[PDB]
Each structure stands twice: as structure tokens, then as C-alpha cells.
Amino acid sequence: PERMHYIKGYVPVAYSSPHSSLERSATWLGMGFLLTALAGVGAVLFAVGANSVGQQQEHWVLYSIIGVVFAVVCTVLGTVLIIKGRAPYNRYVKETGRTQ
Amino acid sequence: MGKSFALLVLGAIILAGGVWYTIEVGYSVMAIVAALIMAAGGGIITWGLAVAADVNSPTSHKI
Amino acid sequence: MKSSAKLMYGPTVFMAAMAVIYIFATMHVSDGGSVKGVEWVGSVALVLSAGLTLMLGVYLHFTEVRVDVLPEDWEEAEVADKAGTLGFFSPSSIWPAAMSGAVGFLAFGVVYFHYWMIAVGLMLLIFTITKLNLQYGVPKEKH
Amino acid sequence: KHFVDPAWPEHNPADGHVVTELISKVAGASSPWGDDKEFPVSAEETGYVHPYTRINR
Amino acid sequence: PEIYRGVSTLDEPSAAWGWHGLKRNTIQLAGWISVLFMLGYNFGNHKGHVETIWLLVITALLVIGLLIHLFEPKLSQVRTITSRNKPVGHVEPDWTYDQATLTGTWGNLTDSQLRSVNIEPSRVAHLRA
Amino acid sequence: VTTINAIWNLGPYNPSQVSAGSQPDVYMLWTDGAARVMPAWELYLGNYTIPAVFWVAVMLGILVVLLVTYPFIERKFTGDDAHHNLLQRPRDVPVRTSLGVMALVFYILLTVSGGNDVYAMQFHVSLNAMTWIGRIGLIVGPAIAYFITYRLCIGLQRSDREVLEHGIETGIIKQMPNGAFIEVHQPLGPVDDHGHPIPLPYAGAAVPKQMNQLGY
Amino acid sequence: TAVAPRVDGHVAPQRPEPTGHARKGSKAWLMMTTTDHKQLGIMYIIMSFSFFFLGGLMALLIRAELFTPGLQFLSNEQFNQLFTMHGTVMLLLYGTPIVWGFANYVLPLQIGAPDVAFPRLNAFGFWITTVGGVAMLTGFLTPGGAADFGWTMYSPLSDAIHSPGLGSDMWIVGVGATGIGSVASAINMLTTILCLRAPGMTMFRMPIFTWNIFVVSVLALLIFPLLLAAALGVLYDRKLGGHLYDPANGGSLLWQHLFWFFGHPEVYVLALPFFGIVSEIIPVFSRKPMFGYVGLIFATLSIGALSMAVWAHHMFVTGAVLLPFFSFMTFLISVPTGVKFFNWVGTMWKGHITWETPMIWSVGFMATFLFGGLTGIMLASPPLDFHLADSYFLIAHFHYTLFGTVVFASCAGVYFWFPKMTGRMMDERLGKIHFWLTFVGFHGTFLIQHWVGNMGMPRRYADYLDSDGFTIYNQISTVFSFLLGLSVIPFIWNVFKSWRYGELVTVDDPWGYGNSLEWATSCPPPRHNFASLPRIRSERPAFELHYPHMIERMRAEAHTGHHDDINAPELGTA
Ligand code: HAS
Ligand code: HAS
Ligand SMILES: CC(C)=CCC/C(C)=C/C=C/C(C)=C/C=C/C(C)=C/C=C/C=C(C)/C=C/C=C(C)/C=C/C=C(\C)CCC=C(C)C
Ligand SMILES: [Ca+2]
Ligand SMILES: [Cu+2]
Ligand SMILES: [Mn+2]
Numbered sequence A: 001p002e003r004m005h006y007i008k009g010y011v012p013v014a015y016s017s018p019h020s021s022l023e024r025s026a027t028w029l030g031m032g033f034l035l036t037a038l039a040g041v042g043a044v045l046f047a048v049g050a051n052s053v054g055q056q057q058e059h060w061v062l063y064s065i066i067g068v069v070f071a072v073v074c075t076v077l078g079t080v081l082i083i084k085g086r087a088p089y090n091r092y093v094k095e096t097g098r099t100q
Numbered sequence B: 001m002g003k004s005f006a007l008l009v010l011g012a013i014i015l016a017g018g019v020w021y022t023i024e025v026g027y028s029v030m031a032i033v034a035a036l037i038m039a040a041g042g043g044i045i046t047w048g049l050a051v052a053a054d055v056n057s058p059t060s061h062k063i
Numbered sequence C: 001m002k003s004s005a006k007l008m009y010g011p012t013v014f015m016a017a018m019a020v021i022y023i024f025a026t027m028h029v030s031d032g033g034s035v036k037g038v039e040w041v042g043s044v045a046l047v048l049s050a051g052l053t054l055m056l057g058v059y060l061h062f063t064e065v066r067v068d069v070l071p072e073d074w075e076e077a078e079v080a081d082k083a084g085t086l087g088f089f090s091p092s093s094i095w096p097a098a099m100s101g102a103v104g105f106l107a108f109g110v111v112y113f114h115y116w117m118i119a120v121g122l123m124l125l126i127f128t129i130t131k132l133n134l135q136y137g138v139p140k141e142k143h
Numbered sequence D: 001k002h003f004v005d006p007a008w009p010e011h012n013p014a015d016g017h018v019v020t021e022l023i024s025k026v027a028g029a030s031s032p033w034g035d036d037k038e039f040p041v042s043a044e045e046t047g048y049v050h051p052y053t054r055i056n057r
Numbered sequence E: 001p002e003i004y005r006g007v008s009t010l011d012e013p014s015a016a017w018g019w020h021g022l023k024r025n026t027i028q029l030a031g032w033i034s035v036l037f038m039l040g041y042n043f044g045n046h047k048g049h050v051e052t053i054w055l056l057v058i059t060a061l062l063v064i065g066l067l068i069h070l071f072e073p074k075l076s077q078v079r080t081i082t083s084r085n086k087p088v089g090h091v092e093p094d095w096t097y098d099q100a101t102l103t104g105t106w107g108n109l110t111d112s113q114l115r116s117v118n119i120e121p122s123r124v125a126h127l128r129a
Numbered sequence F: 001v002t003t004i005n006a007i008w009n010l011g012p013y014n015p016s017q018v019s020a021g022s023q024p025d026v027y028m029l030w031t032d033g034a035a036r037v038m039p040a041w042e043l044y045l046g047n048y049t050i051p052a053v054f055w056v057a058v059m060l061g062i063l064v065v066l067l068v069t070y071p072f073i074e075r076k077f078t079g080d081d082a083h084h085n086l087l088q089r090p091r092d093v094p095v096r097t098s099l100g101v102m103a104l105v106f107y108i109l110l111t112v113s114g115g116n117d118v119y120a121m122q123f124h125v126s127l128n129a130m131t132w133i134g135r136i137g138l139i140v141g142p143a144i145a146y147f148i149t150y151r152l153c154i155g156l157q158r159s160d161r162e163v164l165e166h167g168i169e170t171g172i173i174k175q176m177p178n179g180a181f182i183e184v185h186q187p188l189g190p191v192d193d194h195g196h197p198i199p200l201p202y203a204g205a206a207v208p209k210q211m212n213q214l215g216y
Numbered sequence G: 001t002a003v004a005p006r007v008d009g010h011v012a013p014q015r016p017e018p019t020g021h022a023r024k025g026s027k028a029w030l031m032m033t034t035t036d037h038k039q040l041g042i043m044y045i046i047m048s049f050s051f052f053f054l055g056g057l058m059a060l061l062i063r064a065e066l067f068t069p070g071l072q073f074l075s076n077e078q079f080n081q082l083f084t085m086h087g088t089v090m091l092l093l094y095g096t097p098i099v100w101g102f103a104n105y106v107l108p109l110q111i112g113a114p115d116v117a118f119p120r121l122n123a124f125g126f127w128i129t130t131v132g133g134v135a136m137l138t139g140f141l142t143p144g145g146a147a148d149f150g151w152t153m154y155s156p157l158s159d160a161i162h163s164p165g166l167g168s169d170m171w172i173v174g175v176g177a178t179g180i181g182s183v184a185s186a187i188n189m190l191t192t193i194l195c196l197r198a199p200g201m202t203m204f205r206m207p208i209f210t211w212n213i214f215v216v217s218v219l220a221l222l223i224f225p226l227l228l229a230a231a232l233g234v235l236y237d238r239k240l241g242g243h244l245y246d247p248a249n250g251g252s253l254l255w256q257h258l259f260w261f262f263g264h265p266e267v268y269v270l271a272l273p274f275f276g277i278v279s280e281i282i283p284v285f286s287r288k289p290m291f292g293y294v295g296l297i298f299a300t301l302s303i304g305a306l307s308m309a310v311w312a313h314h315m316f317v318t319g320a321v322l323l324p325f326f327s328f329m330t331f332l333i334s335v336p337t338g339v340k341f342f343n344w345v346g347t348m349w350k351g352h353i354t355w356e357t358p359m360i361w362s363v364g365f366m367a368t369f370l371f372g373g374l375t376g377i378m379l380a381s382p383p384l385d386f387h388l389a390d391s392y393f394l395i396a397h398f399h400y401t402l403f404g405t406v407v408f409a410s411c412a413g414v415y416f417w418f419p420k421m422t423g424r425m426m427d428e429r430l431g432k433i434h435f436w437l438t439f440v441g442f443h444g445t446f447l448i449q450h451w452v453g454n455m456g457m458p459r460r461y462a463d464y465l466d467s468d469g470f471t472i473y474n475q476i477s478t479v480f481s482f483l484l485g486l487s488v489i490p491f492i493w494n495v496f497k498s499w500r501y502g503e504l505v506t507v508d509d510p511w512g513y514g515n516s517l518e519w520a521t522s523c524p525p526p527r528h529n530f531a532s533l534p535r536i537r538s539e540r541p542a543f544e545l546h547y548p549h550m551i552e553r554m555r556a557e558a559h560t561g562h563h564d565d566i567n568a569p570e571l572g573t574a
Helices: A025-052 A060-096 B004-024 B029-056 C002-007 C009-028 C040-064 C095-112 C115-133 E024-043 E050-071 E095-101 E111-116 F026-037 F054-068 F070-078 F094-114 F116-123 F127-166 G028-032 G037-065 G076-110 G119-141 G166-195 G208-239 G251-286 G293-306 G323-332 G334-347 G357-380 G382-388 G392-422 G428-447 G449-455 G471-501 G541-546 G548-556
Strands: C084-088 F043-045 F048-050 F168-175 F181-186
Touching (some): A025 A060, A025 C009, B004 B029, B029 G428, C009 G323, C040 G208, E024 E050, E050 F127, E111 G548, F026 F094, F116 F127, F127 G028, G037 G471, G119 G166, G251 G334, G323 G334, G323 G357, G334 G357, G392 G471, G428 G449, G541 G548
Antiparallel strands (some): F043 F048
């Protein structure tokens, strides 16, 4: 423990190493929000589709705007959080020069 | 190759025996038994085809 | 237990977000072919499903900040690391079958709703559970 | 000071602890007879008495 | 392992301590008497025939069981080979011991492969000599 | 604390009146159940008749004779006449204990057939189905009881031998440096120099099967 | 990395004897007191298939009655009870128990543990599930028969007013006893994976099967107690004078929402483990590792996460649910299933496929479930569901998905792990016969029911007129249904014969290229599953154990355009 040791010519499977991104909570939370973001895409599609046949005439702008707002906040949150969770991996790749 | 011919032929008449009886009897309880005879014929047909499949591409090479 | 403590955060946040989205949606969208108004069944289920996954995740994380670098989680561990006692495991026991039968008797009792069957079922059930829990601690025969 | 059952294993709290609601020194469940024991033991140390017995013919 | 009053200790571990083996003829006799009684049951004053279906099914299964117990047929152990499985004369190498010793199935690995398993060949050159 | 035979609400006897649940006492229900399951076979011979209830008398008498004369029909097939003073554990005598459970299920089927009027009323199974359950069960259920009881007894004594030749399985599992998962067994008798128990001969006395039964 | 010195006169451990050599009485008391995960899993599997045959007999009776117009030998009541009990036993007594049986046998071998976390709890789960099964089936002994309200048990039809008779109650208890049996099985599988993993087996070196079982464990723990609460509420309304499910309280839609919130995760619980079983089978017989491993893990977790939001697409014709939201979510849940399909065909891409029996079953499962899910997408859109809902189109859809994911893939799993479970190999010829019979009989039975569903035949119809215009299609369905019934004869005979006289297994992996850890140990395993643990270093312990010379290739060709990271300098010191 406390440090790894690889000889030249040896390539391991990278997962669950101390530098791995799967081992940290930011990444998984970002996956959750990234999945959530597609709901806003569905919402805006529902709004404009209902508009296409002359329905939802009294609220369709609000539904489209709130769908887009939720989508953009969720997707940017997921992307940023994922990148934060992957920062240790980038530092390790700078450190060692091995990708796996 | 092999038994698959006869196992098919034995079925082909039994299936013919089934459907004929099905078109003979009216809507009745015996129509159920006619369906069973017909399906038994179909099963022996596929049984012949499956032994043929095993003979064409064996995967248990040594008897 | 690091990875599994933290991978539970995706399902729980997704369920919570769906719960809030759904509550706002059903309380506002007056679409034809449906009736406006918040529905409590479904929303309660979503929030308490998020609750279940959050309970699991938070307990596992709260525990995992205590434990050491176990060899099963160390990516280059040797088979000699885990040498020693793994733990105690029950070799055999008749009591799972007995208490399954007791629960069956109780269930049949509430089927017909004969009160004596319910009472005898509950008594038999706690008896069998107690015998299960005291199996490896019954005193030696007192002479 | 508090009482301690002598079956309790000895340890130094200053560098660890024996068992808590969250963590323990075992992967599975602890031994009902004490993890500090070292089974097996001798025949006479077992306390068992095997009976010789015969029946009529 | 000795035989006591007709039964082997391997089949009945307490064969010497009591009454263990009923003769197969007795089992047959009891079964046939039971079948005769259960076929007699269907000569009473009952009118329906659901009773008959139950009786006839159970007696048919009784007779099937009694016939197989009478003859006790057998099949042979099949001697085919299905896949990379090997015939009965095979000897299985301890792959784990070979892995942990670089001997047997893990012996004579080249330098590249030894590096591929995080083992420097310098610590192994004499072992493969 | 429990009422029994509340006669005050049954009224006095007169031969024209009867109740749905009118079974005899519990210890007589078997001889009621016999009368319920006999399939009405009656003989007519000119000026005479043997009623259908003579056969239950014959059956119950045979049932009582078998119980009365049991030790001698045990002798004739067991092939011994020794002066035993030590008891047999029932697991070690699978034939007799299997016949005992067989007789128990026979007696219980007779009993519940005697009480089937109440059983069908309460648990909602058809009354004809209960009589036929009694009839066919008095043949079939004894056989199933014999089979299961015999195999269970053999399994019990196999567990006894397993302990006596390998020692108690504590349940403490430990991993060796090779990764092999081993369970430390605690011997009862001496151990060979290879480090494993020497088997003890079974003696008919109970074998301890856990470590809480050695004081630990 | 350490290399040990040689041992003087070493001999491999005595691997256990195969099955069929057992003495008299060698399993009775062992069975009654069992707390071994693997024997217990075998009996799980046998009991589940017993219930499978029992339910399928009722299915064949249904088909025989619908062969022609007019009620030939069933009434309306008997037909109703038949489809109710067929659905209930096939979903709850076959499917979920077979899932937990395969989990109990395989998962400790895959994660390199000796036993499950809680043995007696596992035995309790088995026995209580069988108790629930017998309670559920006891309804037929009632003079009035068993429950008759469909496997969903919609209200007010299940009210005390509208469903008297004790069979309706026995269903409720039989289901509940089954549900807690499932929960007791799940408590183990989470705790086991969390606490008993082998050294060096990090979480992302687990096989895909145990990942699916993990996700299914959390999903099942979410949803079984909700069923128990709803069911106890219904029994409370029935036996006492309760009013919670009264229609004037909104009880009908309350029950529908609560039940289907339970029920759609149940179908995903049946779905994921068999996806995992084929995800283990396909890499072995194509001699290629699993394609997109962590991608498949993310897809499985995505299915688990989406299953909880999809539930109300079973109610598009109720006029109560919000259509666009649930239609969008049940479109989203198609994506990871398609990812899994793409990964399967990808790992098969330019492989060396050998066609032993489990590979045949796996490709058959893929072919069937493709059309099943393709039909499910059509059911997902409301405007098509307005016509399709609760018709024979729905029947064909869920029989495609269930018969594909459960029956085909469970048979694949049985053939795959029969060596490891018995120490003997199944008859190949009987296996092919069984496969072709089941395949042709199935597609004959259920492909034509799409058309009767479209033409207008509703589900659960016991009798129909000659003038309606769909008698010939039912006749074609019925003949191939009897063929489906006949198909299981070779399966039963093959299992029976192979158990007691089958080909003995010598090597640890008769298929040759087993990737997962259970193929490194003996056939059968010892009592505690492992006489020695390999050096676990990837998702293929057994493969890299048995083929050391392949390792340098296996680590190098893994990624398209793989980086130069093999040439990177040394990183530390011992
Ligand atoms: C194991 C058991 C089951 C599985 C698996 C299953 C899968 C699905 N089902 Fe289902 N089903 C429904 C929808 C789906 C969807 C969307 C999927 C998904 O798993 C399907 C995804 C699977 C695939 C295999 C996808 C295709 C694969 C690929 C690779 C391409 C990706 C997809 C693309 C590109 C989109 C498709 C493109 C197009 C152009 C169409 C709906 C409603 O949307 C109902 C209720 C209808 C009603 O009115 O009652 C329903 C009803 C049932 C019932 C009803 C029981 C009863 O009523 O009593 C059962 C038991 C059942 C079981 C199962 N079902 N299903
Ligand atoms: C896992 C889930 C399921 C499987 C598998 C399954 C298999 C079949 N199904 Fe189905 N089912 C239908 C037809 C079939 C047929 C022909 C088979 C086949 O797999 C059956 C053949 C397979 C067998 C396996 C039986 C052969 C038995 C033999 C050959 C011998 C028996 C004797 C013995 C002694 C057995 C040996 C015993 C030993 C112990 C060794 C039909 C229509 O043709 C409907 C709709 C009808 C309506 O109107 O609502 C239906 C309804 C349902 C429902 C909805 C119920 C409801 O709406 O309430 C569900 C959830 C469901 C699930 C499942 N079903 N099915
Ligand atoms: C009063 C007092 C004193 C007391 C109480 C009352 C009384 C007296 C009582 C008495 C009782 C008794 C003694 C009883 C007895 C009984 C008995 C012994 C019985 C017997 C029976 C038998 C039988 C029925 C048998 C049968 C058999 C059979 C069926 C067989 C079969 C076989 C086969 C089929 C083979 C194969 C197997 C299987 C399938 C399982
Ligand atoms: Ca009809
Ligand atoms: Cu669904
Ligand atoms: Mn509807």
C-alpha cells in the first residue's frame, strides 16, 4: 500500500488505482446529473411538439424555457463535476507518462 | 444425413394425419386432440431437423 | 469499500431530481387527456426511494472513511495479504426451515383469519427466531 | 473504572479499538467462542468422554 | 465395512445396531396390495368420475413406480468428449502453484511475457537455466 | 380457563335429532374416521346380510392386533432374541422408526377424517374431497411417510459418523497463504502424526455437533 | 510481484467426486439443515423449474381452450383462474427464484469468497419462498378455486365486495411470502460483494454478472417491501372493514400506481441478471474479452436508475397519468439495453465462435429479445398504446421479452454451469434438439399473436364468436403452443441422464476459455469453493491463469490505437 510499483514493460488494468477517477464521488454525482440533464431536452421537445398541433398555447413558452434552463444547468454541472473528478488522473498522467 | 430422413418422413404423415382430422371434426373437444396430433407431427419434424443439425456440425466429436 | 460507497450517488440524485421534476410537472401541466393536480402516490415513492439509496450511500461512506487500505481493494495485492481468520460462518442449522414453516402457519392463519392461528403463529414465530439467535450459545448440559 | 468481561480480548485503545458499530478486525462475523482462541485443542482439553459400549448377542 | 443381516455399512452406517433393510419382495408385495385396494375403491356408490380420474392417475403412477422398482433398470456412463474437456486418464496440473512458482505450465516464459506479468527476468534467469 | 363439553347448550337426548359436528371424543375420532372412509361394501346372502360396517370392525381389530403383538413380529424379522438393557436411538433403527411414523400418519389421517366435518367447514375444502383424501391418503401417505422417515434417519446417522471421523466443524474459516479456504475442525479423539483425527467407533450415544456443547 | 520457492514432492489437492455417486440418505438431512450457498442454489434452481412446469401446464390448458370458439371443457371462471395463476407462478415462483438461485451459486465463486455473508438467512429465504409457493397454489383446493383477477389484481375488483372466496386471499399471502424470500436473498448479495471479495479483486475486476446482481439487489430491496405494504393494505381492506382502496377514495388508480411502481422494477430485476449470464457466456465461446466493460457497467447502473422513473407507462389508457413525461422516460430506458446489444455484437465481431450448446442458447436469446424490445418501443408511445394496450399484442410483446430473457438465457446458464455445478457435461445432441424445438415452437406460438392483437382480440378473453374473424390465427398459435409444451421433454431427460451418468469433467474449464474466476477452481468446487486462489489482476483471472503467453497480447491489443505507455519508465521500488 501507500504507493504502486511497476517495472518497465508492464501495463496493468488502470481501474481502482489510487489515481483512478472511478474511486471518487464527484465523478458518480456528475454521472447522475448528466443523466438528469436529458429530462430538460425531453421537456423542451414536449413543449414545441404540443405547439406543433396548436395545443399548450397558454404555457408553451414557459415550458420550453424552463426545460432549456434545467437542461443547461444540469449538463454543465455534470460536465464540470466529471472533469473535476478526472483531474487527479490528469495529474497522474503528467507525473508518470503512462495512460493506463 | 442419417436418421434425419426417416425421422422427418415418419413425422410428415403424422402431421398430415393431424391436420386432416382437424378439418374433419367440427368445433369440439376432439379438435383439441387433433391439434395435439398435429403438434406432435411438427415436433417430430423439428426433431429430425435438429438431429440433422447435430450431424452437419458436430460439437461432441468423440463418441 | 470505497468505490461502492460512492457509486450509489448517481441513482439517488437521479431519483431525487425526478421526484422534484415530477411534483412540479403534475401540479402545473393541465394537459388534455389527463387531470391536473399533485399525485402523492409515486411522488412519495420516488422521494423515499431516493431516501433508501441515500441511506445506503451515506452509511457506506461514513463507514469507509474509517477503514484502512484493505487488500481486496488494493490493485496489486498478494494472496498472502488476507491470510488469517476470515470470520465465523454457520455450518448448519434446522431453524431457517422451522421459522419458514412458522411464518407459513401465521400466513395461513391470516388467510382464513382464525384468531387462534394468528396467535399460535406469532408465538411459534418468535420461538423459532429465538432458537435461531441462541443456536451457538445454548449452555452446555448442566451435568 | 468500568467492568470488563474477562472473555473480552485485550487491546490498547491508544493505537486502535476492539469493535465499533462501524468497523471490526474481521471480514465476516466474530467467533462466538472468541477470536483470541486458537482451535484445535487436545482431546482431554476438549472435555469430551467417548463411550465404549457393547450390546447383547 | 461389513455386511450385517444383508445390508452394507456403506449404505446404512448403523447397520449393526438395528433393523435396516426391508427385502425388496416385501416392498413389491405391499405396493401391489395397495394397488389392489385402491382399484377396489372405485366400486362404491359414488356417481361422479373426478374421483375416478384421481384414482386412476395415482394407481398408474403407483404401477409405474412398482415396475421400475421391480426391474430397476440402468444406463451406462457415457464416454463422449464434448469440448476442450479431456478423457478420464488426464492429470490436472495445479495452475495456481505453477503461477506462484513459474514452474510447469508457467515455465519457460520468454522475457517479454515475464515483463508483462511484472516479474523482472533478472530474478528468474537461473530458474529457467 | 377453557370450557370443555358445554352440555348445557346441547339439550337432552332424543333419537330424532342430530348436529352437523357430532364427532365422539378426540381419542375415539380414529374409529369414527374408519367408518367415514369405508367404501360401503355390503354382502347379501339370501335370508342374511353382512352390513358394510363389519369391515371397519375387522380393520380396527387388525390394527389393534398388530399393536398388541408387535415385539414378536419384530423378533421374527429382526432375527434376534437377546436380553437388551440399553436403548436404541431412533435414528439407528430406521425400519422401526419409519414404521412408527407410518403408523402415526395412518392414525392421524383416521383422526382428521373423523373430524373432517369440522375441517371442511372451517378451512373450506369440499366435504367429498375430504373423504377421498382420507381414503386415498390411508394408502398413499403412509408410503411417503416411510420413504421420507427412512432417508432422514440415514442422513442423521451419516451426520453422526461425519462428526466422529472428522471432528466438530467449529465454523471458524481461515485462509491459508496459498489462498485455500479451510475450516478448523476440533477433534474429539487423538490425532495422527499427519495432523488429522483418528476415527472413533460409533457407540450409540449422542455425538456433540457444535462447540457450544463442549463448554466453549 | 513475488515468486515462491518450489515445494518438495508437491501434489495437487484431491478434487471432489462428481455427482450421481451419492449414497442413500446422503442429502435428506443435509438438505434440511443446509447452509452451503451452492447446494442451496442447486435446490433453488430445481424448485423454480418445478414451478415452471406447473405454470406452463396451465398455459397449455388456456391455449387448448382457445383452440376453437365455444367453451369446450373450461368455464369462464376456470379460464380466469388459469391465466391469473399462470401469470403469478411464472413471474414470482419461477423467475425471481431462478434469478436468486443462479446468484447464490455463482456469485461467491466469481467474487472469490467461501460462503455468502448470511448463510442461515439464505436458507430462510429458500424455505419461505417455497412456503409462499405452496400457499399460493393452495387456492385450487378451495371449492371455488384460486384467485381470478389477473396477476395484477386491479381494484375495486379485488375488494371484499367484488372478490369473495379465500383463494383471492391466498394469492396475497403467497405473493408476500415470496416477496420477503426475495428480500432475504438480496440482503446477502449486497453485503457479500461489499465485504467478502478476494484479495486483489477490486470492484472493477468483477465479472459483469455479479455487477448486474449487485444492481438488482439494490433495485429489489427498493421495490419488494412496497409490494408487501400494498398487499397488507389490501388484506386489511378485505378482512377488516377498511376503505383505503375504495373507488370513492380513488382506490383504483392508487392501487395501479403503487402496484406498477413495484412491478416494472420486477421485470428489470428479471432482465438484468440474464443479460449478465449471456455477457459471461458470449466472451467465452467467441474467445474474445467483453467489449466495453466499464461501458456495460454504466449501462447496467443506468438501467437500474431509470427503472424507478419509468413505472407509469403501464397506465396510458387510464386517463390519469401524465403522458409526455412517462413516454419520454420509457424511451430513455431503451438506450442502455441497446448499448448492451451493441456490446454483445461487438465482442462477437471477428471472433472465433464455436457453437457448443450455451452459445446457441445465447444467440437465440439475442434474436428473440431483439424483436421483443423492438415491440416494446412501439408500446412505449401513447398514441400507439391507445390501440395496443391490453390486447394480444401486449401478450406477444411481454412473452417475447420474458421467454427470451428468462427461459432462453436460463437454459443457457444451465448448460453453461452444469459442469461447475455437477462435475459432468450435458448431452450435446439432446441440447440441440431442445433448442430447436423450443425455438420453432415459440416463434410459431407468439409471432402470430401480434396479428390477433392488432385485429382486435383483447387479452384475457375466454370465448369468442365464430364471426369475429380470428379463429384460424388462434388455431395456428395453439398447435405450436403444444409443440412448446413438448419441447421440455428432452430437457428433463437430458438433465436427469446427465446428472447420474453424464460425461465426467476432468479439467477445471471444459469449455476451455472461461474468463471468470469460477473456472479456475475444481468441478465441482470443494465445500469452501477454493483450494487455491489465482493471482487476480484483470476481468479475466481464469483466462490469464491458463494462458500466460497470451497476457502480453491481452494487455497490448485492448485499445484501438493503443498508447506508448508500455515503454514508460519504472515507477517505484519494492
Ligand atoms: C423481462 C420482462 C420485460 C422486459 C425486458 C420488457 C421490456 C420493455 N417493455 Fe415491457 N412493456 C412496455 C415497454 C417496454 C420497454 C420500453 C421495454 C424495453 O426494455 C425495450 C428496450 C429493449 C431493446 C432491446 C431496444 C432495442 C435495441 C437496440 C439495439 C436499438 C436501440 C433502440 C432504438 C434505436 C430505438 C428503437 C427505434 C425505433 C425506430 C422504434 C410497456 C409500455 O411502454 C408496457 C405496458 C403497456 C400497456 O399498455 O400495458 C409493457 C408491458 C409489459 C408487461 C405487462 C404485464 C401486464 O400488463 O400484466 C410485462 C410483463 C413486460 C415485461 C417486460 N418488458 N412488459
Ligand atoms: C416467465 C414468464 C412467462 C412464461 C415463461 C410464460 C410461458 C407461456 N405463456 Fe404466459 N401466457 C400465455 C401462453 C404461454 C405459453 C403457451 C407459455 C409456454 O411456455 C407454456 C409451455 C411450457 C411448459 C413448460 C408446459 C409444458 C408442461 C408439460 C409438458 C408437462 C406437465 C406435467 C408435468 C408432470 C411437469 C413435470 C414436473 C416435474 C416436477 C418434473 C398466454 C396465451 O397463449 C397468455 C395470455 C392468455 C390470456 O387470455 O390472458 C399468457 C399469460 C401470461 C401472463 C399474463 C397473465 C395475466 O394477464 O394475468 C404472464 C405474466 C405470463 C408470463 C409467462 N408465460 N403469461
Ligand atoms: C387404542 C390404542 C391402543 C391406540 C390408538 C389406536 C390404534 C390401535 C392405532 C393403531 C395403529 C396402527 C398399529 C397402525 C399401523 C399402520 C400400518 C402398519 C400401516 C401400513 C401401511 C402400508 C401401506 C399403505 C403401504 C404402501 C406401499 C406402497 C404404496 C408402496 C409403493 C412403492 C413404490 C411405488 C415403489 C417406488 C417408490 C416411490 C414412487 C416412492
Ligand atoms: Ca374454446
Ligand atoms: Cu414496465
Ligand atoms: Mn386499463
